[PDB]
């Protein structure tokens, strides 16, 4: 009787199913959450008189219908068009070469080009109908507003590392962007994968290749699967023979089956409309004093700085520099960002060994952390590489039968070294990784592991006749703070010929290691690594109540009242009586 | 008149049958339980106006329809795609090489490749319709909330080994994950199994193999079973002759029969939608102070640590290291995880014998446990391998005719040894296993059993002329704490050439034994070993009442009131009056 | 107006006919009883809107449809797949090699392979629809709860041997398992039995055998019985000639007749759904203090130990060790469990004779049991083999015409011996068996019987010229406590070349005897031996009232009130006043 169903009973019209305002992940092109609030109170319609739209939504009739007769050749996977999220992946940002490179449509296309030495062609029937946009005066959703107040409460009780944790659960549930405009329509695409040596002789008749690819697309749709085709004349005999893959997907409308008139596909697009393009803005753009009137001024500029840090950390991880030229050697298959590390010679290095010590600062009673946090050399110059503090909580139970239990914490800082007539290297495996020497979390035969950063193992053998089959050279560790001195004989990268691999993200700082195997390189493409990148804190910090919030340079002060009402602006006679009881 | 039927009478629409929130087992890809609460109070619909969804559920219209013209070749069973649970099996975890390897679809495919020396190809018509997700603000179910309170009660009455037992009945009923997003659709798959020598000559024309496999798939669906096929031209005469198996399964929609137009299959998918992909999060992720507001803070971080231990124990069991290379010798067929134990030479070892002693600490009256817990040598250096305590309860009946009965317990610790001109080895069989020398729970001819770990038998014969037909060599025992010293002449694995086998899980610690038979290896694939891995306790521990719960480092205290009301936060004037009567 | 018919009048929908919660016998794959309570109060439906389900039941839509084009060859009957109860027969148990080996489908398949030297192939169209499961919070049925209280009453009046008898009537009525999940669907199977020498020459073209077997299956279903087949080309001329049997069974849906389109069979599966797979848990798993809140704690752990003993006794009986290799001699046809007793030489033994004595302890008046309980030698070293006490009740009638009758009992312990120039052996026959020398309960010509264990006869003749046609050698008696000393010249088995046979189960202990005939071996397969394995007791034990039940180690006590109300927990001030009047 309220909301949609009140409008839907009076009008008896469908609701438009393609709406802006939701969140958007831009590494994996998926949408998530609902940032903006959508209400159906005025019973608005599209001025066709055909759909029902919310109140803060205006549509623009496009009624456009493209129809292409030539496929387009896109040879490299580095410059990637998306066909559904092209306007939002190509924004001007620092990470424009990482957007969209963890999606379903991209990971298939990179696989089919590398494993077959192939080039791809697509041809398309696109058919845009509306453009749906949001008004500039707009209200946040009920569930998204409550999660911004919780980050503000943790920042005003001096609880960092809990506000940081709640900011990374905001990226996980709402993405990195907000879509401000969509495009309702229905596409129909065919992608083929031709052998790359079929293009190189037909450099003059490249226009004859793509003319037959768009010719075969309209035989596939118009003719039923039995061969009544009109394309097999001259070069639709090697086009069929140099191709390595073919698929046809429809995105809106009715489902596609071979042999359906393009007349009949285009008459089922009504009431089956999806978003075939979209654009938007980053997520921290919508955190400003205009959208949040209840909080003070400089407090929402501190929440918006926390969310901006969590989004940029999510792009800093899931970024793999390496070599990208396919015909060159040292080709890294997991790399999504070029480095210039191609055509670079190598030089062998000898590492003496790794060792690890612990400190055991506070928790001397009832918990002994400083036995597994220590690792000594099985057999140069060591480097420190990390200063990491490990905290653990335990439980007493004082009984008196009534009892009580108290929770302490136990700190133990550890230090992990490596030496710059030497131990061999057999790979690494962690609690989120495997060793690709064995395709399993095990060192090979003869090798023995030893812990280095409290979560991963270091496959090492001291021999020179039996473990020489799995021995791969080593290039050096570095971190987010200290680069290795092996490059520039500093910078944070591998030397030439080597490739880096992530290992052991530890509280907003990952360390890396350089190898030269060729076996760590290949395999399947890695998935995206989702936030939170930190385990939850133990609530060890005490809450410090803040009552008055001020800034010095325009003489504005916000006084929180009793009862936790709200933040009102401080009149200059009440803050005069509130600072004496404070100071 | 409430719930679904109120919405279903007014709207007269079906309910969407593919919903998130339920549990999920990730070794065997099955779903179980319902972790999240789903309510039908606002009578929401999918904005098509076609289905009825719960209140805390938002759908995303995809309306996508893939159609592939080439089969894909996947040669090895080690890297396994699932086609229905691929997004959730490939999560970043320690046990990513064990997920999905106890399911129906996997165990068939490993069988058909090993027993035939075959490779598999699949081709598919996939047709995704919606994406159904859960809101981040969400309530636990009524039945799952009550089983988390019962683990908290056992932890606050100092009843360990009962809270551990109730945590393993939570994994049995709700799985190891919670699905947070599903994909409603309907697939149609054909899998074939070609002979592996048919690929190796057609290395150049591998693209001609897969083009005919996708050609035969569309003759099978479009043509009725009588041969009107258009594929038998050149190489659809050995493709039919090198194949070893073939099946066609449909997953959603109407049932498949040979000869049905793809037009007609795709028009029955409405109202018959199933989950063709899903993703989720682990089960202990959803146990936090946000979801459980009634319990104290550090108490739900102790329940969530108990459930995390029970899940990781379920992956530690059902893990079989061994050799995996098929053409190599020493191939272990039961192994699902590689070891590097391939291409390793063997060395014979002589074991003197096993013997077992008992202690009989407490139950000296009315129960004699220390006669069957003892086993002496029928005929080096012994090792201890285990220190296990065996508890049994009995019953007095004091009569006075009125009577009364009291229940005691009887402890008897046992020790089981083995010696590092020697007894022969004929296999083992237990209360959950058989001896594969006989395919039965019996020692062979000439062999006599003797107990070793209070539940299994050790087939042994002292002769050298008659029991030499069933004698297999022996490689050594080890446990979850002590590895054998026979490897590295320590580590917890077999020496080279040998294979390990589980025997006698005893209270969260299994022991293993290394053999070299070739007969223990083969057979059928083992099923998953389900929790609980411990028999129920005898309630021997006394309940210790806890009233006040505190942590030291933010000065928060929770005071349980009378009547067992609930846990309220302790004001600093009531805990001042509650600690004096306590201490 | 209540229950099903209230929901069935409002909704006008059928009820789903495949439900969990019932019992299950696992030797004979049949279902029996109803352990869990099923109520129809909320009028729930399957979210199709198609069936009506109970309240504590959730279904999972599968909508899957397999279709196989190759038969599968299963050569041996030892590893047996069931096609309807495969998930529940393959549980991890001690008796996994006995599950399902007394069913209708197994006993036919073992018969057709032994009597014809044949191998079996099956091909199948499987079509799974739903998966129906039970919630973890669940209530026992009304009739099953009342039979668990009756076992508890006999255990608390010190009436053993009546609680043991009532526990074996619980296995008879409710089976050994409870099904927790079923699979609604409809299969369609063809089984053939080919001659075993037809496989051995087609080792390379085994893939051509199974391709024609799945080809003949789809000619049988699609074509009417007149020969319009498309299979008779090359090897569908000896496949028809090497086969020894053929049947086609349907399990759900409409009945099968030759010539029906697979289109038409798959459209009758709606409203005709049966269980095509199931899984479950043992019966004593569901006897715990959670399911039975009224009884005390350690009392339901004593009922659950009694039922576990009665189930394991039912698997200990119906287990026949013997030789299993078919081409080897000494092949035992009744044996369902291997022994290693194949390829073993024999040695003749001479037994002097059997004799039997009685004691007549108590019933000296009015009943003379010690004349038929005695048997003396008709003509070494004797062994005792059994100490069994025989009790009989009689009736006085004291008259005074008014009268009264009193019932006593008469005990008479008997002892049965056999001697380790000798009596010949002609077989045995009992009150539940026959002599297979005559296929009747009679000794052969010249032989005379003599009683040994108060119920069976021992066919014996002292001659050496006339009873030499029916004389078979003898291998020795043993029991559940004492093995024979003839093996290991101890163990409880036959010597080599001999086979054991059951005789005279007497109060939870059977004795066995070893022969070497070849005529006792063959015949028909024995049926399952159902509980109770003990005649009912004579109520000779006096009832001892128990009022207070306690355990020592958590200081909990349960005080039964007056009137036989119930068992309430004892407060520490009432048991203080209840133990003084007790002790
Ligand atoms: C507010 O929080 C910050 C962040 O932890 C505190 O700063 C640290 O406090 C510890 C405790 O003495 C010091 O050892 C560190 O050196 C401090 N670090 C920095 C960068 O200042 C701060 O003390 C807290 N303030 C209050 C009043 O609790
Ligand atoms: C892949 O493409 C090449 C073209 O670069 C094909 O090679 C030509 O095939 C035609 C077919 O008759 C010949 O007449 C030409 O002589 C070939 N060479 C050149 C340089 O044009 C090749 O055949 C294609 N692959 C397949 C499998 O057909
Ligand atoms: C709480 O439970 C723990 C777990 O059993 C008890 O700890 C053990 O108690 C026994 C009894 O004296 C000792 O023999 C063990 O050495 C203890 N083990 C450990 C690791 O502490 C503990 O005593 C219980 N506390 C109370 C008050 O009952
Ligand atoms: C399995 O595949 C092999 C190909 O590796 C087939 O062998 C070829 O069969 C064709 C059939 O006429 C012959 O012309 C070739 O000479 C064979 N050899 C090669 C190297 O191509 C084999 O026939 C297939 N199996 C069956 C049963 O047909
Ligand atoms: C409770 O029942 C048991 C089981 O029969 C009784 O135990 C036997 O009692 C007879 C009668 O004196 C003795 O001859 C046996 O030696 C007893 N056997 C055992 C194993 O104890 C027991 O006496 C009964 N108790 C009462 C109070 O009636
Ligand atoms: C049972 O199978 C055997 C195959 O092992 C058949 O023997 C063959 O029959 C064909 C029929 O013409 C002959 O051409 C072959 O020479 C036979 N022998 C071999 C070794 O292949 C046998 O005929 C089958 N039984 C029946 C009754 O047909």
In DSSP notation, A163-215 reads HHHHHHHHHHHHBSEEEEEEEEE--EEEEEEEETHHHHH-STTHHHHHHHHHH
Residues contacting residue B43 through CB under 8 Å, at least 6 positions apart: A5, B6, B7, B10, B11, B52
Task: Tell the burial category of B19 from Cβ atoms under 10 Å away from its Cβ (0-12, 13-18, 19+).
Answer: buried
CA distances (Å), origin C229, targets B92, B226, C438, C511: 54, 10, 50, 58
Q: For residue A142, count other CB atoms closer than 10 A to its CB.
A: 10
Does ligand 6 have an atom closer than 6 angstroms to the CB of C197? Answer: yes
Which of B95, B219, B553 best probes binding to A when mutated, by most A CB atoms within 10 angstroms? B553
Q: B326 with B110: CB under 8 angstroms?
A: no
Residue A283 DSSP label: G
Q: Atom 5, ligand 4: which residue's CA is nearest?
A: B198
Q: In whole angstroms, what is the distance from residue A376 CA to residue A452 CA?
A: 10
List the one residue out of A418, A408, A429, A410 whose CA is nearest residue A357: A418
Q: In whole angstroms, what is the distance from residue B211 CA to residue B209 CA?
A: 6
Q: In whole angstroms, what is the distance from residue C283 CA to residue C179 CA?
A: 10
Handedness of CA A179, A182, A188, A194 (dihedral sign): negative
Pocket of ligand 4 (CB under 6 A): B 195, 197-198, 201, 238, 241-242
| Measured CA angle at A13 (ends A10, A14), to 5 deg | 135
Give SS3 for C581. Answer: helix
Looking at the CA of residue C202, tell me the nearest atom of ligand 6: 5
Give SS3 for A254. Answer: coil
Closest-CA distance of chain B to residue C62, Å = 7
Q: In whole angstroms, what is the distance from residue C447 CA to residue C466 CA?
A: 10
CA of residue A512 to ligand 1 center, whole Å: 30
Residue C176 DSSP label: S
Q: What is the largest CA-CA distance in chain B?
A: 96
Give me A24's structure tokens: 């958007």
Resolution (Å units): 3.5
CA of residue B145 to ligand 1 center, whole Å: 38
List the one residue out of A57, A58, A100 whose CA is nearest residue A82: A100
CA of residue A541 to ligand 1 center, whole Å: 9
Does ligand 3 have an atom closer than 6 angstroms to the CB of A399? Answer: yes
Handedness of CA C11, C17, C21, C22 (dihedral sign): positive
β-sheet bridge partners, residue B474 = B515
Task: Tell the burial category of A544 from Cβ atoms under 10 Å away from its Cβ (0-12, 13-18, 19+).
Answer: exposed
* Phi, psi dihedrals of residue B61, rounded to the nearest 5°: -75, 120
CA of residue B302 to ligand 1 center, whole Å: 28
C95-105 burial, b for 16+ CB within 10 Å, e for fewer? bebbbbbbbee
Give me A354's structure tokens: 């790794």
Does ligand 1 have an atom closer than 6 angstroms to the CB of A160? Answer: yes
Q: How far is CA C189 from the centre of its chain?
A: 26
Give me C389's structure tokens: 């006490």
Q: B404 with C582: CB under 8 angstroms?
A: yes
CA of residue C328 to ligand 6 center, whole Å: 26
Give SS3 for B580. Answer: coil
Size of interface B-C (CB pairs under 8 A): 169
Task: Tell the burial category of C142 from Cβ atoms under 10 Å away from its Cβ (0-12, 13-18, 19+).
Answer: exposed
Strands A511-515 and A499-503 turn out to be antiparallel
Q: In whole angstroms, what is the distance from residue B430 CA to residue B452 CA?
A: 10
For residue A93, how many C-alpha atoms fall within 13 Å in the half-sphere facing its CB?
21
Q: C278 with C24: CB under 8 angstroms?
A: yes
User: With helix as H, strand as E and coil as C, how does B176-205 read?
Assistant: CEEEEEEEEECCEEEEEEEECHHHHHCCCC
Q: In whole angstroms, what is the distance from residue C22 CA to residue C16 CA?
A: 15
* C-alpha distance across the termini of chain C, in Å: 56
* Chain C residues close to B395, C-beta within 8 Å: 302
Q: In whole angstroms, what is the distance from residue C466 CA to residue C58 CA?
A: 72
* C-alpha distance across the termini of chain B, in Å: 56
What are chain B's partners, defined as 3 or more CB pairs within 8 angstroms? A, C
CA distances (Å), origin A403, targets A393, A550, C274, C568: 19, 46, 56, 27
Are B445 and C341 within 8 A, CB to CB?
yes
Q: In whole angstroms, what is the distance from residue C162 CA to residue B260 CA?
A: 64
Q: B392 with B409: CB under 8 angstroms?
A: yes
Closest-CA distance of chain B to residue A402, Å = 5
Q: In whole angstroms, what is the distance from residue C159 CA to residue C536 CA?
A: 12
Give SS3 for A559. Answer: strand
* Chain B residues close to A245, C-beta within 8 Å: 69-70
Q: How far is CA A531 from the centre of its chain?
A: 9
Helices (H) and strands (E) in chain C, counts: 10, 26
Handedness of CA C95, C96, C98, C99 (dihedral sign): positive
Are A527 and B92 within 8 A, CB to CB?
yes
List the one residue out of C120, B574, B135 whose CA is nearest residue A22: B135
Task: Tell the burial category of A195 from Cβ atoms under 10 Å away from its Cβ (0-12, 13-18, 19+).
Answer: middle
Q: C191 with C122: CB under 8 angstroms?
A: yes
Long-range (24+ apart) CB contacts under 8 A made by B87-92 are: B87/B277, B87/B278, B87/B279, B88/B24, B88/B26, B88/B177, B88/B179, B88/B278, B88/B279, B88/B280, B89/B26, B89/B29, B90/A527, B91/A527, B92/A432, B92/A433, B92/A527, B92/A529
What are chain C's partners, defined as 3 or more CB pairs within 8 angstroms? B
* Phi, psi dihedrals of residue B93, rounded to the nearest 5°: -150, 170
* Chain B residues close to C496, C-beta within 8 Å: 445
C167-176 burial, b for 16+ CB within 10 Å, e for fewer? bbbbbeebbb
Q: In whole angstroms, what is the distance from residue B118 CA to residue B192 CA?
A: 10
Q: C107 with C5: CB under 8 angstroms?
A: no
Give SS3 for C316. Answer: helix
Q: In whole angstroms, what is the distance from residue C372 CA to residue A265 CA?
A: 96
Q: A523 — alpha (psi -120 to 50), left (phi > 0) or beta?
A: left
Q: In whole angstroms, what is the distance from residue C142 CA to residue C145 CA?
A: 5
Q: Atom 9, ligand 3: which residue's CA is nearest?
A: B541
Q: Which of B90, B127, B133 sits opposite A255 (nearest CB)?
A: B127
* Chain C residues close to B438, C-beta within 8 Å: 338-340
Closest-CA distance of chain B to residue A366, Å = 15
Closest-CA distance of chain B to residue A28, Å = 13
CA distances (Å), origin C388, targets A544, B58, C195: 83, 74, 51
Which of A85, A225, A265 best probes binding to B when mutated, by most B CB atoms within 10 angstroms? A225
CA distances (Å), origin B150, targets A397, B167, B295, C242: 20, 10, 12, 64
Q: A484 with A478: CB under 8 angstroms?
A: yes
Q: A187 with A576: CB under 8 angstroms?
A: no
Residue B96 DSSP label: T
Give the closest ligand to the alpha carbon of residue A401.
3
Q: In whole angstroms, what is the distance from residue B32 CA to residue B23 CA?
A: 5
List the one residue out of C254, C336, C388 whose CA is nearest residue C77: C336
Helix axes B163-174, B142-155, angle to 10 degrees: 160
CA of residue A395 to ligand 6 center, whole Å: 80
List the one residue out of B9, B51, B55 whose CA is nearest residue B36: B55
Residues contacting residue B245 through CB under 8 Å, at least 6 positions apart: B112, B116, B118, B191, B192, B193, C70
Are C92 and B399 within 8 A, CB to CB?
no
Q: B515 with B501: CB under 8 angstroms?
A: yes
Place of tokens 């073919």: A246
Closest-CA distance of chain B to residue C207, Å = 6
Are B337 and A440 within 8 A, CB to CB?
yes
Report the residue of chain A nearest B494, measured CA to CA.
Answer: A445
* Phi, psi dihedrals of residue B569, rounded to the nearest 5°: -75, 135
Q: What is the largest CA-CA distance in chain C?
A: 96
List the one residue out of B505, B514, B504, B457 whose CA is nearest residue B484: B514
Report the residue of chain A nearest B221, measured CA to CA.
Answer: A225
Place of tokens 């010798």: B329
CA distances (Å), origin C413, targets A469, C357, C525, C541: 77, 9, 35, 18
E strand or H helix that includes residue B276: strand B274-282
Q: In whole angstroms, what is the distance from residue A254 CA to residue A527 CA?
A: 31
Residues contacting residue B242 through CB under 8 Å, at least 6 positions apart: B194, B195, B197, B198
Q: In whole angstroms, what is the distance from residue B164 CA to residue B169 CA?
A: 9
The DSSP-derived string for B472-534 is --EEEEE-SS---SSS----SS--TT-EEEEE---SS--EEEEE--STTT-SSPPPP-PSP-S
Q: In whole angstroms, what is the distance from residue B281 CA to residue B82 CA?
A: 18
Q: In whole angstroms, what is the distance from residue A143 CA to residue A153 CA?
A: 16
Closest-CA distance of chain A to residue B267, Å = 9
Give me C39's structure tokens: 């109520």
Q: In whole angstroms, what is the distance from residue C229 CA to residue C231 CA?
A: 6
Residue B68 DSSP label: B
List the one residue out of A192, A190, A194 whose CA is nearest residue A118: A194
Closest-CA distance of chain C to residue B314, Å = 16
Q: In whole angstroms, what is the distance from residue C138 CA to residue C558 CA?
A: 25
Report the residue of chain B nearest C124, measured CA to CA.
Answer: B247
Are B143 and C158 within 8 A, CB to CB?
no
Q: B382 with B480: CB under 8 angstroms?
A: no
Q: A63 with A121: CB under 8 angstroms?
A: no
List the one residue out of A508, A470, A514 whose CA is nearest residue A490: A514
Are B341 and A445 within 8 A, CB to CB?
yes
Size of interface A-B (CB pairs under 8 A): 165
CA distances (Å), origin B121, targets A468, B72, B73, B555: 37, 5, 5, 63
Q: Atom 14, ligand 2: which residue's CA is nearest?
A: A238
Sequence positions preceding breaks in chain A, C–N over 2.5 Å: 379, 400, 420, 489
Handedness of CA C202, C205, C208, C213 (dihedral sign): positive
Give me A319's structure tokens: 């970024």
Give me C331's structure tokens: 């092949």
A368-387 burial, b for 16+ CB within 10 Å, e for fewer? ebbeebbbeeeeeebbebbe
Does ligand 1 have an atom closer than 6 angstroms to the CB of A545? Answer: no
Give the closest ligand to the alpha carbon of residue C544.
5
Helix axes B163-174, B297-316, angle to 10 degrees: 70
Q: In whole angstroms, what is the distance from residue C16 CA to residue C6 CA?
A: 16
Task: Tell the burial category of C386 from Cβ atoms under 10 Å away from its Cβ (0-12, 13-18, 19+).
Answer: buried
Give me C317's structure tokens: 């009986």
Q: B447 with B436: CB under 8 angstroms?
A: no
List the one residue out of A214, A497, A486, A202 whose CA is nearest residue A331: A497
Q: Atom 12, ligand 4: which residue's CA is nearest?
A: B238
Give me C314's structure tokens: 């039912």
Does ligand 5 have an atom closer than 6 angstroms to the CB of B402? Answer: no
Which of B88, B90, B94 best probes binding to A when mutated, by most A CB atoms within 10 angstroms? B94
CA of residue A247 to ligand 2 center, whole Å: 23
Pocket of ligand 2 (CB under 6 A): A 195, 197-198, 201, 238, 241-242
CA of residue C452 to ligand 5 center, whole Å: 29
Q: C392 with C322: CB under 8 angstroms?
A: no
Handedness of CA B93, B97, B103, B109 (dihedral sign): positive
């Amino acid at each position: 009787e309220v909301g949609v169903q009140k409008c839907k009973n009076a009008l008896k019209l469908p609701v438009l199913e393609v709406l802006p305002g939701g969140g958007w992940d831009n590494l994996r092109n998926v949408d998530m959450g609902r940032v903006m609030e959508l209400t159906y109170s005025n019973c608005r319609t599209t001025e066709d008189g055909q759909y029902i739209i919310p109140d803060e939504i205006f549509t623009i009739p496009q009624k456009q219908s493209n129809l292409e007769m030539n496929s387009e050749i896109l040879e490299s996977w580095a410059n990637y068009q998306s066909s559904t999220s092209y306007s939002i992946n190509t924004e001007l940002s620092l990470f424009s070469k990482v957007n969209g490179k963890f999606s379903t449509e991209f990971q298939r296309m990179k696989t089919l080009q590398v494993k077959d030495q192939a080039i791809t062609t697509r041809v398309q029937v696109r058919n845009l109908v509306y453009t749906v946009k949001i008004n500039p005066t707009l209200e946040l959703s009920s569930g998204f507003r409550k999660e911004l107040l919780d980050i503000s409460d943790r920042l005003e009780n001096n609880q960092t590392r809990m506000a940081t944790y709640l900011a990374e659960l905001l990226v996980l549930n709402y993405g990195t962007h907000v879509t401000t405009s969509v495009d309702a329509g229905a596409a129909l695409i065919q992608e083929d994968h031709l052998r790359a040596s079929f293009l190189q002789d037909s450099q003059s008749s490249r226009s004859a290749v793509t003319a037959s690819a768009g010719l075969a697309f309209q035989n596939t749709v118009n003719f039923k699967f039995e061969e009544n085709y009109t394309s097999q004349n001259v070069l639709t005999k090697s086009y069929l023979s140099n191709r390595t893959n073919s698929r046809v997907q429809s995105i809106g409308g009715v489902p596609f089956y071979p042999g359906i008139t393009l007349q009949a596909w285009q008459q089922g697009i009504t009431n089956h409309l999806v978003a075939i393009d979209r654009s938007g803005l980053p997520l921290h753009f919508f955190i400003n004093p205009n959208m949040l009137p209840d909080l003070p001024g400089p407090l929402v500029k501190k929440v918006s700085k926390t969310v901006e840090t969590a989004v940029k950390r999510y792009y800093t991880f899931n970024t793999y520099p390496g070599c990208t030229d396919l015909n060159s050697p040292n080709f890294n298959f997991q790399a999504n960002t070029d480095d210039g590390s191609c055509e670079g010679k190598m030089t062998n290095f000898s590492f003496g060994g790794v060792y690890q010590e612990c400190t055991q600062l506070s928790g001397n009673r009832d918990v002994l952390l400083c036995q597994k946090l220590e690792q000594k050399n099985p057999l140069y110059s060591p480097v420190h590489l990390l200063s990491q503090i490990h905290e653990e909580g335990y439980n007493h139970l004082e009984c008196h039968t009534v009892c009580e239990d108290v929770f302490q914490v136990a700190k133990a800082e550890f230090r992990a070294f490596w030496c710059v007539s030497g131990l061999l290297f057999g790979g690494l495996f962690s609690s989120k990784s495997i060793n690709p020497m064995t395709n399993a979390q095990s060192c090979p035969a003869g090798y023995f592991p030893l812990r280095l950063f409290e979560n991963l193992k270091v496959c090492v053998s001291q021999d020179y006749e039996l473990g020489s089959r799995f021995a791969v050279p080593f290039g050096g560790f570095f971190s987010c703070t200290v680069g290795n001195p092996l490059v520039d004989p500093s910078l944070k990268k591998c030397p030439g010929g080597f490739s880096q691999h992530p290992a052991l993200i530890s509280d907003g700082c990952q360390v890396s290691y350089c190898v030269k195997s060729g076996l760590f390189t290949g395999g399947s493409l890695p998935p995206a690594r989702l936030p939170p990148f930190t385990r939850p804190p133990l609530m060890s910090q005490a809450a410090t109540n803040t009552v008055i919030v001020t800034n010095s340079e325009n003489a504005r002060s916000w006084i929180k009242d009793s009862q936790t009402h709200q933040w009102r602006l401080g009149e200059p006679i009440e803050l005069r009586r509130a600072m004496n009881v404070i100071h």
